[PDB]
Amino acid sequence: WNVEKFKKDFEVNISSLDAREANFDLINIDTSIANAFRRIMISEVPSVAAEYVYFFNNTSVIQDEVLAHRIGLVPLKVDPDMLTWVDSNLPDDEKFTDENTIVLSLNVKCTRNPDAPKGSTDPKELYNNAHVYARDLKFEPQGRQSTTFADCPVVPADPDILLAKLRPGQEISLKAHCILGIGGDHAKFSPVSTASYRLLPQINILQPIKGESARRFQKCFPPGVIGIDEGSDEAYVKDARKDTVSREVLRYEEFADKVKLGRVRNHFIFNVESAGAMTPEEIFFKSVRILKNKAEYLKNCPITQ
Amino acid sequence: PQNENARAEALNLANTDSQYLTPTSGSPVRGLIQDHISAGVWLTSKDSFFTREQYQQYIYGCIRPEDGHTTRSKIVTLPPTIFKPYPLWTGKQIITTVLLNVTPPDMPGINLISKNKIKNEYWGKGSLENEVLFKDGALLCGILDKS
Amino acid sequence: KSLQYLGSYIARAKKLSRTQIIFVASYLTSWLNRYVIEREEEVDQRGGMERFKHFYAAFQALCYIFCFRHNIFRDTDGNWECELDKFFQRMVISKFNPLKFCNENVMLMFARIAQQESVAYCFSIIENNNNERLRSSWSLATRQQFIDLQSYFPYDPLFLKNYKILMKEYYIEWSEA
Amino acid sequence: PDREKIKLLTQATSEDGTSASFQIVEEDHTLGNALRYVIMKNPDVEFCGYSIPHPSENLLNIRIQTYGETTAVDALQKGLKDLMDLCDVVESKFTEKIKSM
Amino acid sequence: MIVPVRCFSCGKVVGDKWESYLNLLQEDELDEGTALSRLGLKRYCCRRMILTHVDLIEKFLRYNPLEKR
Amino acid sequence: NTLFDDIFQVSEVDPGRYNKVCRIEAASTTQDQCKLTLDINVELFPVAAQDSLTVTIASSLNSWRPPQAGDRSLADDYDYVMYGTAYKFEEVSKDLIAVYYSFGGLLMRLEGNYRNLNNLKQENAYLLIRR
Numbered sequence: 001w002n003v004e005k006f007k008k009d010f011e012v013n014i015s016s017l018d019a020r021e022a023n024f025d026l027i028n029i030d031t032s033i034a035n036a037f038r039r040i041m042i043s044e045v046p047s048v049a050a051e052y053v054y055f056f057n058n059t060s061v062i063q064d065e066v067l068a069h070r071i072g073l074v075p076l077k078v079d080p081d082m083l084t085w086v087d088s089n090l091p092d093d094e095k096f097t098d099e100n101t102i103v104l105s106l107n108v109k110c111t112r113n114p115d116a117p118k119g120s121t122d123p124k125e126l127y128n129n130a131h132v133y134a135r136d137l138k139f140e141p142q143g144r145q146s147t148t149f150a151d152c153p154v155v156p157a158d159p160d161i162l163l164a165k166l167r168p169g170q171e172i173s174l175k176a177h178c179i180l181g182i183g184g185d186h187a188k189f190s191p192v193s194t195a196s197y198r199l200l201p202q203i204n205i206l207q208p209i210k211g212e213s214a215r216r217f218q219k220c221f222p223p224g225v226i227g228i229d230e231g232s233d234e235a236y237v238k239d240a241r242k243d244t245v246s247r248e249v250l251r252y253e254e255f256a257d258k259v260k261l262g263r264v265r266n267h268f269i270f271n272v273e274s275a276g277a278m279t280p281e282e283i284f285f286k287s288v289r290i291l292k293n294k295a296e297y298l299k300n301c302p303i304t305q
Numbered sequence: 306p307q308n309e310n311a312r313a314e315a316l317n318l319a320n321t322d323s324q325y326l327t328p329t330s331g332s333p334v335r336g337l338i339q340d341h342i343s344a345g346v347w348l349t350s351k352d353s354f355f356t357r358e359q360y361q362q363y364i365y366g367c368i369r370p371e372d373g374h375t376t377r378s379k380i381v382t383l384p385p386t387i388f389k390p391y392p393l394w395t396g397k398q399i400i401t402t403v404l405l406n407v408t409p410p411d412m413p414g415i416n417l418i419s420k421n422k423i424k425n426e427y428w429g430k431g432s433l434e435n436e437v438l439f440k441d442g443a444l445l446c447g448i449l450d451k452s
Numbered sequence: 453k454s455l456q457y458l459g460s461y462i463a464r465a466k467k468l469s470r471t472q473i474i475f476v477a478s479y480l481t482s483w484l485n486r487y488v489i490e491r492e493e494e495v496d497q498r499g500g501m502e503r504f505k506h507f508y509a510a511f512q513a514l515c516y517i518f519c520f521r522h523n524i525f526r527d528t529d530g531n532w533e534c535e536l537d538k539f540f541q542r543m544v545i546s547k548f549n550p551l552k553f554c555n556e557n558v559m560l561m562f563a564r565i566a567q568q569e570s571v572a573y574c575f576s577i578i579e580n581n582n583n584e585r586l587r588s589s590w591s592l593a594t595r596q597q598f599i600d601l602q603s604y605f606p607y608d609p610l611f612l613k614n615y616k617i618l619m620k621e622y623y624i625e626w627s628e629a
Numbered sequence: 630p631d632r633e634k635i636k637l638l639t640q641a642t643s644e645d646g647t648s649a650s651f652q653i654v655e656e657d658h659t660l661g662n663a664l665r666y667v668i669m670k671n672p673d674v675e676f677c678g679y680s681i682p683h684p685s686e687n688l689l690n691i692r693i694q695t696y697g698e699t700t701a702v703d704a705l706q707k708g709l710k711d712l713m714d715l716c717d718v719v720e721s722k723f724t725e726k727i728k729s730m
Numbered sequence: 731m732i733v734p735v736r737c738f739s740c741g742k743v744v745g746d747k748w749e750s751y752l753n754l755l756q757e758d759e760l761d762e763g764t765a766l767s768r769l770g771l772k773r774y775c776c777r778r779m780i781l782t783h784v785d786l787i788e789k790f791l792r793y794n795p796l797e798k799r
Numbered sequence: 800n801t802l803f804d805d806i807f808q809v810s811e812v813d814p815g816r817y818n819k820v821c822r823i824e825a826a827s828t829t830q831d832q833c834k835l836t837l838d839i840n841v842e843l844f845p846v847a848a849q850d851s852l853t854v855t856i857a858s859s860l861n862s863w864r865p866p867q868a869g870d871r872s873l874a875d876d877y878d879y880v881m882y883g884t885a886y887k888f889e890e891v892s893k894d895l896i897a898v899y900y901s902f903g904g905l906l907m908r909l910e911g912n913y914r915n916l917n918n919l920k921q922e923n924a925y926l927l928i929r930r
């Protein structure tokens with residue numbers, strides 16, 4: 001082995017890329033490294049989420065800490081590069097700056113609606129502001145942010161998230177500070193609605209299988225995985241890439257003898273979904289970079305005896 | 306305990322470590338259970354083989370040589386069972402290697418002829434895997450078990 | 453601790469006579485010359501450089517004394533009392549490698565001054581030392597107390613208004629030396 | 630600098646330095662496994678493995694023994710460098726494929 | 731009580747999907763598994779969150795101490 | 800140096816309850832009294848009944864480390880090589896003897912005439928097999 005030998009053999013295939021999810025294969029890479037990227041994407045790629053919630057009033061049916069919690073789960077559409085990290089050794093006054101923190105406010109009172117169509121069940125027409133949504137988090141820019149974030153207001157990635165419900169007379173009033181964090185610390189910071197991989201299917205047939213066996217054999221795998229060839233009448237593999245590895249074949253006695261199920265073994269099929277802040281490819285790039293910095297930061301640290 | 310006399314007693318008289326045998330009948334009370342028995346039947350199976358990489362990793366993950374058991378200040382390994390076509394170690398070698406790294410070096414390896422709970426018939430024709438054989442500290446035959 | 457006291461005292465105490473000072477230098481180089489003659493052989497043997505705390509301790513004190521009072525150790529000829537020119541070099545190049553194990557700020561100041569006085573050249577040995585560092589071993593569990601003990605100087609200047617004034621007649625401020 | 634990250638465990642490191650154990654803070658399987666993979670490709674390395682004393686103390690123990698051409702500390706450095714270079718190769722390859730996509 | 735915001739396992743936002751899911755069952759007269767799919771809930775992780783949610787809050791809300799019943 | 804070789808013909812290849820190891824029973828083609836029993840990683844060296852295997856036991860090959868630039872040894876002449884220990888000898892009859900080997904658990908039992916197996920000692924040994 002040798003880094004050049006790796007470069008010549010490594011390969012990437014991008015099946016589908018989208019603003020929310022990516023499906024791609026890493027080919028001829030070692031499991032230890034694929035796993036690294038996977039772990040890093042879930043737990044070490046920074047994101048912005050609400051961390052501290054300051055209540056001035058909440059007379060809703062939902063308790064403060066619980067409300068605070070859900071606000072923290074709301075994925076904010078914020079570029080984490082636009083923020084610096086908080087130093088948690090300073091007092092509260094010094095701790096939060098215009099490079100540190102994003103402030104969201106929320107201010108709803110519920111009143112009864114006079115103009116309700118008599119005999120109505122719907123709370124939209126019965127009550128004003130009965131339902132509180134993530135979109136109701138108002139972005140309040142501080143200091144330089146009026147400028148910096150003028151081209152991209154802070155908005156939740158999923159506006160229609162139900163946050164709270166109210167009835168006449170109840171109010172919610174809170175400010176939230178949102179900062180950088182990582183999934184390993186708390187899952188609210190994870191930038192994925194999940195990054196995972198599977199090893200690629202390898203279905204290899206240990207002798208020809210034809211006729212009524214072919215049709216039978218073909219039905220042990222999802223539609224399109226196994227083909228029946230015209231001519232030799234024998235079964236062959238169309239694309240393993242569609243296989244779910246149910247191992248259904250291995251149940252029927254006649255086939256368990258004639259098939260081995262494996263993988264194209266390093267060959268990793270990654271699926272990455274973004275929680276909404278960054279694109280998948282950015283999140284994967286950021287992870288490949290994070291791994292490299294670990295190695296670089298370590299190479300440059302002095303070894304103390 | 307709050308003074309050195311009580312310390313000495315808790316470390317030398319009422320300490321766990323001695324109390325391997327019960328005073329009732331003089332038999333063992335400490336051993337491994339569940340996952341660890343099932344695991345042993347598998348790891349010490351004839352079907353069990355490991356590459357250099359795996360073998361060395363199992364060893365270091367369990368030895369903890371950075372301890373009071375500096376029987377050596379270098380981990381010792383065996384040569385592989387299969388040299389060619391590919392270097393492979395067996396599970397039974399992992400056991401031999403473990404004992405080899407934690408028993409005293411100035412002292413010959415253990416010698417034991419014993420039996421386990423699984424009849425030879427279960428492995429196939431001609432098996433002797435029910436017979437547990439340690440010669441000079443090496444597991445030469447048999448799987449390891451609740452027994 | 454005594455060796456720190458000893459070195460701090462000789463350096464600071466204004467009413468000391470040239471010869472009482474040379475007395476302490478003559479004791480230290482003498483005791484030092486013996487240490488290196490009888491013990492250097494123990495370095496490449498089994499153990500660590502801590503085995504020699506006491507050596508560095510004394511060599512520090514002597515170096516420190518040289519910082520504050522080097523202008524005194526030149527006799528009428530312009531020669532050095534105690535052959536300090538020839539002596540320092542020998543220790544600096546020894547296997548104990550004092551420069552690496554003594555207080556960093558003193559070793560530095562001694563370098564500066566010693567080099568200036570054509571007494572010794574340490575600066576390449578220092579370079580080598582903190583290069584080997586980036587890339588002679590001592591635990592650091594106990595290595596720190598020593599660094600701590602070698603940082604304290606019991607007669608570094610006073611900060612009590614009156615006492616200070618009262619001490620002036622008996623004190624040499626660094627600016628004076 | 631930062632001296633508290635990696636340290637030598639002098640009670641399992643030989644006189645000749647061809648064998649050594651290091652304790653690295655704040656690192657688990659992620660770096661550990663990747664680093665031993667890389668190190669074991671070094672032809673002068675006779676032994677290498679990593680272990681995690683306990684899931685509750687953030688500590689990583691690496692062992693390296695060489696055949697005597699380089700020291701154990703050398704192998705650690707080549708491994709770390711090799712690992713960095715390996716990531717570069719991946720980043721560059723991924724970039725090209727995104728562009729070409 | 732109220733819809734969870736994210737799926738416990740996936741991390742995927744699910745809280746914007748409750749009111750619509752009900753409208754799918756009700757108005758479009760779909761079965762549960764068809765409706766879940768139409769909202770983008772693919773992993774059984776995520777289908778579980780909406781499939782088995784109990785909007786208990788709508789019960790809590792009927793006791794409002796701040797209005798003359 | 801070499802301690803024993805012979806061409807054996809395989810009678811039975813039993814996979815037992817394993818799926819990487821098989822128990823092989825085989826008789827010599829040169830001695831009517833020499834027979835063999837051997838566990839083999841058949842994933843690395845497949846064997847079928849009626850195969851003919853050349854089987855060599857040797858004391859050395861002319862401590863272990865991964866192959867390097869231009870290493871040459873007795874292993875080069877064969878397909879499958881194992882290292883192990885002789886752990887038991889037994890009298891079978893007035894004329895014949897059996898020796899027992901373990902290769903990290905994979906067991907060999909070699910029975911033969913006491914003159915035909917003269918060189919075998921209770922030591923470690925390499926096993927070499929080629930097709």
Ligand SMILES: [Zn+2]
Pocket residue numbers: 737738739740742773774775776777778779
């Ligand atoms: Zn889910």
